[PDB]
Amino acid sequence: GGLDRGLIAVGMGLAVGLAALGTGVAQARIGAAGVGAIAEDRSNFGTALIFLLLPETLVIFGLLIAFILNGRL
Amino acid sequence: GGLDRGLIAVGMGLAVGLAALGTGVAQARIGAAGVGAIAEDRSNFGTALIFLLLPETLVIFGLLIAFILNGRL
Amino acid sequence: GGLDRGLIAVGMGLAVGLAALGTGVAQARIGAAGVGAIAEDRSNFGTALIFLLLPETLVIFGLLIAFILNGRL
Amino acid sequence: GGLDRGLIAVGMGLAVGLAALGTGVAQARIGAAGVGAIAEDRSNFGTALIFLLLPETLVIFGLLIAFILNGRL
Amino acid sequence: SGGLDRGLIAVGMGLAVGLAALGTGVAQARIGAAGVGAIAEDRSNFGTALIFLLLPETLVIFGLLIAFILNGRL
Amino acid sequence: GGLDRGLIAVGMGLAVGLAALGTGVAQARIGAAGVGAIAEDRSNFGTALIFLLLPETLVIFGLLIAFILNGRL
Amino acid sequence: GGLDRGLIAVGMGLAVGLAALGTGVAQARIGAAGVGAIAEDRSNFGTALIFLLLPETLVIFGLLIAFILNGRL
Amino acid sequence: GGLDRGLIAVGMGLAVGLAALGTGVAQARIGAAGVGAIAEDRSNFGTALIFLLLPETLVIFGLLIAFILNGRL
Amino acid sequence: GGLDRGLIAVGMGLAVGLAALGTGVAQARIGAAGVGAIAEDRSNFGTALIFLLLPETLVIFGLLIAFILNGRL
Amino acid sequence: GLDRGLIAVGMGLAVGLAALGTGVAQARIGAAGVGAIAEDRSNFGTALIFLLLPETLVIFGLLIAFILNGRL
Amino acid sequence: GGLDRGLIAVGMGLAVGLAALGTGVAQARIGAAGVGAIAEDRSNFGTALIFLLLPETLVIFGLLIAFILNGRL
Amino acid sequence: GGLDRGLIAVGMGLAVGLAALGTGVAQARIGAAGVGAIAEDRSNFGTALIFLLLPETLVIFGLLIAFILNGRL
Amino acid sequence: DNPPWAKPFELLVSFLNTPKYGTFDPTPVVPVFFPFWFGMIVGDIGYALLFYLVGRWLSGYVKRNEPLVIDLFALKLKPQVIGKLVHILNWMVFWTVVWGVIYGEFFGTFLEHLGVFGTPEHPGLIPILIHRIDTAKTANLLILLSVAFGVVLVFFGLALRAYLGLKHRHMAHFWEGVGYLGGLVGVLALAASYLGNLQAGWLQGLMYLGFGVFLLAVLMSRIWLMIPEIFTQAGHILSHIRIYAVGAAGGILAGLLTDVGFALAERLGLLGVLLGLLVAGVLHLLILLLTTLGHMLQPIRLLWVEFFTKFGF
DSSP states (O other), rough: OSHHHHHHHHHHHHHHHHHHHHHHHHHHHHHHHHHHHHHSSSSOOOHHHHHHGGGGGGHHHHHHHHHHHHHOO | OOHHHHHHHHHHHHHHHHHHHHHHHHHHHHHHHHHHHHHHOOOHHHHHHHHHHHHGHHHHHHHHHHHHHHHHO | OOOHHHHHHHHHHHHHHHHHHHHHHHHHHHHHHHHHHHHHHHOHHHHHHHHTTTTTHHHHHHHHHHHHHHHHH | OOHHHHHHHHHHHHHHHHHHHHHHHHHHHHHHHHHHHHHHHHHOOHHHHHHHGGGHHHHHHHHHHHHHHHHHH | OSHHHHHHHHHHHHHHHHHHHHHHHHHHHHHHHHHHHHHTTSSHHHHHHHHHTTTTHHHHHHHHHHHHHHHHHO | HHHHHHHHHHHHHHHHHHHHHHHHHHHHHHHHHHHHHHHHHSSSSHHHHHHHHHHHHHHHHHHHHHHHHHHHH | HHHHHHHHHHHHHHHHHHHHHHHHHHHHHHHHHHHHHHHSSSOOOHHHHHHHHHGGGHHHHHHHHHHHHHHHH | OHHHHHHHHHHHHHHHHHHHHHHHHHHHHHHHHHHHHHHHHHHHHHHHHHHHHHHHHHHHHHHHHHHHHHHHH | OOSSHHHHHHHHHHHHHHHHHHHHHHHHHHHHHHHHHHOOOGGEEEHHHHHHHTTTTHHHHHHHHHHHHHHHH | OOOHHHHHHHHHHHHHHHHHHHHHHHHHHHHHHHHHHHTTTTHHHHHHHHHHHHHHHHHHHHHHHHHHHHHO | HHHHHHHHHHHHHHHHHHHHHHHHHHHHHHHHHHHHHHTTTOOOHHHHHHHHHTTTEEEEHHHHHHHHHEEHH | OOOHHHHHHHHHHHHHHHHHHHHHHHHHHHHHHHHHHHHHHSSSSHHHHHHHHGGGGHHHHHHHHHHHHHHHH | OOOOOTTTHHHHEEEESSSSSSSSSTTHHHHHHHHHHHHHHHHHHHHHHHHHHHHHHOOOOOTTSSSSEEEETEEEOOOOHHHHHHHHHHHHHHHHHHHHHHTTOOOTTHHHHHHHHEETTTTEEEEEESSSSSSSSHHHHHHHHHHHHHHHHHHHHHHHHHHHHHHHOOHHHHHHHHHHHHHHHHHHHHHHHTTTTOOOOHHHHHHHOOOHHHHHHHHHHSSHHHHEEEEEEEEHHGGGGGHHHHHHHHHHHHHHHHHHHHIIIIISSTHHHHHHHHHHHHHHHHHHHHHHHHHHHHHHHIIIIIIHHHHOO
């Protein structure tokens, strides 16, 4: 018995959701700047992709913590 | 006693909701820049659509975690 | 006689509400840009409507998660 | 007495409130752009009203799921 | 004749009304700012500005509807 | 009972406070625009007062919800 | 019956605090515009003061609700 | 029991904290406008200080509510 | 009882934290305007420092309330 | 025994919110200072003082945290 | 095991999620400025990448705290 | 008897996460200004890096309090 | 060209764009529908008497036909707009009183001091058909009434679109109208089944037939527009709950204002009845001024968006 598994799931969901929220907050302005640079030049595509996909490490670490919690679940 | 199942549902809902919130936060500015670019040039549709569809990975990861939690119980 | 169903409904409410919030956050800026493009040219209504209908996937996935949890109810 | 009744009420209230919040966040920016277009051209009323009334589907889905929860009450 | 469930119902309906009013106010802020700007500019945009201001009231209206349904379950 | 009484108090406090927050959010932008318009023209005073006093309906609704809850006490 | 009194206190504190927060949110932009207009014209002090003191009705109603809960307490 | 004192402490802390947050939100923009005005003209100091100190009534009301709660406990 | 002291600590910590958050929100814009004025002319130092240190009364009130609560402990 | 845990919760919440408020302050203050530095290399000290001034809120939060840990 | 284990998971998830959120908030503006600088010069790749990768220390400390909690539990 | 270890974990996670969030909020604007100054001059990197790494003391204090709580575990 | 009963609502119709010719005139729909659910929303016979007094002042202006100038809104309506507004206001206040009869609580909960109308605990007084503040029957009944009005408008609009497509050889719009009607019938059947009822096998066949009709219409007009539009039409069906929600809000405002007035008069003074009535009237006037604009906007908003965007315009 007890609220063990449920609170573990709550923590897992909080980790994934807030990591994704931070990733989206970064990617908003980064993608806006990338779209502006692509409209200006159309040769900054690789740099824009690198800078946009770089903050995905936040949700990657969130998924790592999620998988750890799921394994201990 | 035990309330694990409903609390697991709470965690799953938090995960998908916050992932969707982060993706919406990104897509706001990204879509605004894309609409501006596609209004200016009418040919930046590929880059604009790629930059808009890229942040949906947050919702994809949130749905993955939600599916894992649902399959847990 | 357990209060598990109430927590399941709480998770449903969290998922749907946060997904709707994210979709609204995206659609705010996207609709502002679309209305500006319509006022400027009015020939890009198709793209303006497409880029606004695109963020509906967030609330669609929120509805899917709520349907899954309501089936679990 | 069952606490599940009150917790389902809490989840329903959360769903309705956050869906209304998302629709308000969208309609702020969209209505500002629409009022600007109206003051500019005086003939953009159809497109402005369509874009303003379109993001109400979020609160529509929220109220649908709230009524589903009230039926399960 | 309920116990803590009645209080939780009250909490839910209060949350619904409060967040619906918050969303309505968030919409009305920018919409009213644009409307007042248009009134100061032209003084003939009163009908359009007033209509656009009063349209987002449906959110708090439906939040009040849901709270009244919850008070029905109360 | 007393626990229901305290939770009803919490609910009515939340309703009144969040309605006040929403009206403050509206009145901030509306009052800024009205003060600017009056400082420019000094004849827009009535329209500014109307546009500032209109958002008070949300506070009125929250207060009446709180008074219904107090009547339940 | 201690939890009854405590939750009544929590509700009244939430009410007064969020009412004060809404009034502050309004008064921020209203006072900024008022100080700008006073520095510009030096004669519209009364209008700016009236518009600044007007949104305190929210904290007035919050205080009324708090005092009602105090009388219940 | 001790729940009354604990939750009344929580309530009064919420009251003072949110009142202080609202006053800070107001005083940010109000003080910025006042600093700009006194940097420009350096004779608007009295009105700038009056407008800056005016929104402290909200934290005064919060302190009033917290003092009432402290006297109650 | 076994929960009174902990909840008193929660209340006083929340009071101090939210008061600090509010005065920080004020000091952000106030200090930005102050540094902008100092860069224009260094003779504004006394008034800028007065305007910056004036919203410290918020955290002073929060600390006073927390000390009063700690006296109960 | 839950008093210890709730005391820890209150301590962490106090210092976290104080740090959040000081981050909010130092954001705009440091942005203005860095913008001012470009000509204000002479006036670097004023910008540094203006940035370091909001640390008093972390000082107060740490004082409250130390008091709560002493009660702990 | 039981309540303590689940609450440990909740705190772990809160730590990693909020650290990721803070890093995303920083990386938004930093990456936008970096992409602008790259579009201007393209010789600023080292400085832009360094300034973007410095906020990752927040997630590093959050993961450190999460691993500490995992080892403790 | 346990049951407080998880709460201490929650408090430690809250402290670390909110300190990280505050430092992210600071470093966003500070690093944006630093990248702008770097793209302007490429010589004030010392001042830019000092001002960027300076607010990290908040995370340092949060980590110290988290270490204190971990020792308390 | 309209009958003289529908002539003032020509103002409301022609405030927007003119019809695209060869199209039916939606003008007589407004006198049929708008005052009906306006009265359903208000139901406050005292507020209706206030509206009648305002209409009498406007008729005095009609006798004083020289223009009414309001520099606050810059409005000039010398004979015709003011005559049409007087006609609309009288036609509307009639149904306001008629629905106030069912809404029998008069000027708020005035039954506390001297009960004219009667709750079911008091059969000796005149009965009230719908208990207003009770929620067990009234909420479901009025929600279903609003849903029924929405369904009636949806069927009328889609049938009109189909008939216009038949007459104008606009067969794509005819197929769209038929498919939308069938799909929304299926959605309504699904909603009725999910509300909780047995014999769902018969509703299953109706839902399947509606979905098949909608699928045929998608196969005709398949180009990316159909199913989001039908979702918005389902939302438009759901949007008619406003006419109950706003009415409940108005009833609660009036009832709690009368409760405050009787708390001032009966419970504390026992002789300050006039003072309590004055305070209640001041609060009623403030509430009336703040809420009347939205209460009159929402029905015409429902018409202007829901019926007119489907029908044409």
